[PDB]
Amino acid sequence: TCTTGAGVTSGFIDLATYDNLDRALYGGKDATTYFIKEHYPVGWFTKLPTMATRVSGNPAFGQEFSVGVPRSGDYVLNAWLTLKTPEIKLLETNRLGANGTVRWTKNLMHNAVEHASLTFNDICAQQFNTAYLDAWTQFNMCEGKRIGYDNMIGNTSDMTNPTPAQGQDGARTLPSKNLVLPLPFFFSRDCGLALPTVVLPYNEIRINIKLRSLQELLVFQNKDTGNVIPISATDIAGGLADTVEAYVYMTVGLVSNVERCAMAGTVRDMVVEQMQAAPTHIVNPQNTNNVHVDMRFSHAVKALFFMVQNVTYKSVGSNYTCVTPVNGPGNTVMEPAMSVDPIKSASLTYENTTRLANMGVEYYSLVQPWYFSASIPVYTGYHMYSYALNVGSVHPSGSTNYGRLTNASITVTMSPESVVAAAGGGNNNSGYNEPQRFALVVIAVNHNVIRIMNGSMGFPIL
Amino acid sequence: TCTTGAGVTSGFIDLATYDNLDRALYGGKDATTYFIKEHYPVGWFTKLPTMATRVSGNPAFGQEFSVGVPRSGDYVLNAWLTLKTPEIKLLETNRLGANGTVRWTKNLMHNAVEHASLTFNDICAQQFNTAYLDAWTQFNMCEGKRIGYDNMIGNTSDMTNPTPAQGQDGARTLPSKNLVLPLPFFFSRDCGLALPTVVLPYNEIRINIKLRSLQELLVFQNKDTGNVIPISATDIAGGLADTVEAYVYMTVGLVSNVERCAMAGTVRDMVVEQMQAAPTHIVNPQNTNNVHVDMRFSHAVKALFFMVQNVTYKSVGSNYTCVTPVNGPGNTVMEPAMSVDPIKSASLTYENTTRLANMGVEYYSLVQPWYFSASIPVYTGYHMYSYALNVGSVHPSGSTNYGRLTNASITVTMSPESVVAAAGGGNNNSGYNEPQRFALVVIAVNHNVIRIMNGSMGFPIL
Amino acid sequence: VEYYSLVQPWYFSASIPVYTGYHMYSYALNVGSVHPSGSTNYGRLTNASITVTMSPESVVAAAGGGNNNSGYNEPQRFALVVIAVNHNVIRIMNGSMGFPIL
């Protein structure tokens, strides 16, 4: 007929095509309709940040300090550590001379923070460290916040850039800017899980953070031969700032008086997710290529994370590649050409019964995250296997109990790149100039039940 | 009147601000509350990968092969294919001489996998091809997994980087690494939809895959003039390997015996999404500036995806731009400056009644994906229209069936760049050195109903 | 300024300051008396302001130009400070303390 751009007579033709299939799909007296949103009232509350008072010593590199959780709140649901890094000034009297650069290690945060623990009175609840932090961040980070996260945890292409001596071309100094590390805890996992501070007047809530020595937090790299040696006080200007200054911030949530009176004086049961780290095992690809490690876990495991870490140098961390990074052109750091994950294949065995056969490393690397996660890692390593449909979902999903399960093992196979990197003899700026050593780490995430009654906490199932 | 340590006075002040608006929004006896997550038990089950047993033929490039779905499982909800690419090495005896390079085509996966179908005995239920795979990947890609999916399909700066002859300065060879292609089916779209293998003891389920010859997968480019010629066995070393290592894996999920007996012998009704492609039409912008294409579809159409493909060379694929890609500086491929989508405008017509006017190409390119899609494409082309609020939502919504609809047509308009690039005359490294050819492809996603009864499946409507 | 400096302390305090500055104003007969005396509440009262006029000596000493051993050799900066002392009520019951009004 006619078209004007503002008429809607065309939609009637589409509407008139109401056949049997459309009748089955849509329509009906009880059928809901769009363009109408049901509104239901929610609770009346208020949130605000809150200071956390330190109780054990003062922050310092290589030392452990404790902070109590502030009371007089109703629900605590956030926690983050803010730390002001010191200023680094390289000196001309370095042991490496002109061919020497100093730079911050990759992932400064998730480093210098190990055995971060939460305790009720004198009963430990959970703890985590660098491996769990790295795996969880690489596997369950929502896109869009990646820039913010890798700008707040370091990795800003400014602290990780090698800096030559004062007498060389690169005289830039590493800036001293504060960094923020959120602390992944069970109450911080979801809003529905919050610590009932009002309901818990007897248990004392404590957080224990152990820092790391500044010696292993700085990478001292040779520009030419690509060799790493530990840093010393005389190598940098101003000495080593052993003491560091930091805070712990948490967010509390106030609730209405009627709600608190109604909910005060009752028993509650909550489901939480913990961490279990298997003891590290040294792997030597020169002798053997197949390594079997026994796994000993207790509760319903939800996922298994593992990787092989280049443990040759303590200064460099979060290196899950057979070859260490080396200095590159333009005062930058770049990975050598031969830089691949040492793991080739893996399998799981339950009391001499392989539940999962010898699948390829690419399977765990890509296929499993594509289906049972919210993100895919952008770095080599971090091989995972999840028994659940959604790892990030706090609601329970498929899992296998390990308490009633007989002893099980995981078998891994090395790679020709790993076995050739284990032997030294690499040329300059190749990373594998010196012999390399590797270690195997296994992390497990399991469910648990916590009961709150009579103003106290505990694990009924242990 | 203080703010020291823990602060609750500010929270009390904030809570005191209660008025009519706050009373209407929050509060009430029936109002829900946060910090308290309701817990409801779910079913007990387990899942594990399972190999799929080939029944017909051998996996080789250029023909058809089918794999049966393993029985004895309880639910099948995931399927993917693994394929190891061969090793390619250039030879000095190439026809093009020094001015000649060989590289893998862009998007190696989704290519050489055409007419991939799922068959119930001898009745088809779902079939997809390269165009549908590309459109779905570009329009429904969750962020964070984009890099992982890209690495799975290739494009890792090694497959797509041209390699010169051995005698020249650059003599690198294309590595041989396995790649994984997930299979998007109705049961793989959502966890709620899965094949009840226990309920289907008599039906036979097959997955049929057609491969393509390596001639159409390998791109042989001229270094200077940017011309592409078909490859021959004598050009490269090793020869054309017809056979290839490739397998199909699927994930099965066991369930508790308590519920399988209860659900045995019951009628199941499901909704599924299927794809249907209009036949391709050759478009010559030199003779005409507008193209009319008739659509003939059956069921409730969800969306239409259309794009004009540069089909000048069968060697190069997944190219929807008026100018073919050419070799660039630095031993890499660079897209020429003249690179725009040939379509300038598009419109729909219902029995000579214009439902959708001559809207701009940028509308379909950006505005429609912004409002009714989960992602926006990062490449030129892939225009789409949607009849529903959410394309990726499994639940049905706004959709008009074409069974009762009369003949419908789509009108597309070329561009001055397309009409000038259709003829040749371009200089070296310009893309349109040789005359170009274009084709139009239309993809429609529709709904259908699947009924399960008496250990068999049929179409109630058909 | 001499009013606040001398007259108010002479009548409503136990001492008079011996240093420059320290200007005060009390709504009560005795500043140091623990027992309540004349006072007004600012919670019900609307916004109140205090306006202070500077001095020619201050405006000439704010800039530099002073010679040696003059104090105002360098440019000078000043800041205004206001302190208020008020009353409140504390309730002790049930083995705890709090403000019934706050």
């Binding site: 207790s298 009579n454 103003g455 505990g458 199932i461 242990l462 | 002040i13 | 919670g43 303390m97 009004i101």
Partner: peptide, 29 residues
């Protein structure tokens, strides 16, 4: 203008311990 009212009453800080619950049915197996 009235300014409303909002008292602050801290809700208890106990220094004792009524009874310590014990752990039963361990997952050690």
């Amino acid at each position: 203008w009235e300014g409303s009212a909002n008292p602050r009453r801290p809700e208890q800080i106990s220094f004792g311990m009524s009874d310590k619950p014990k752990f039963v049915n361990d997952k050690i197996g």
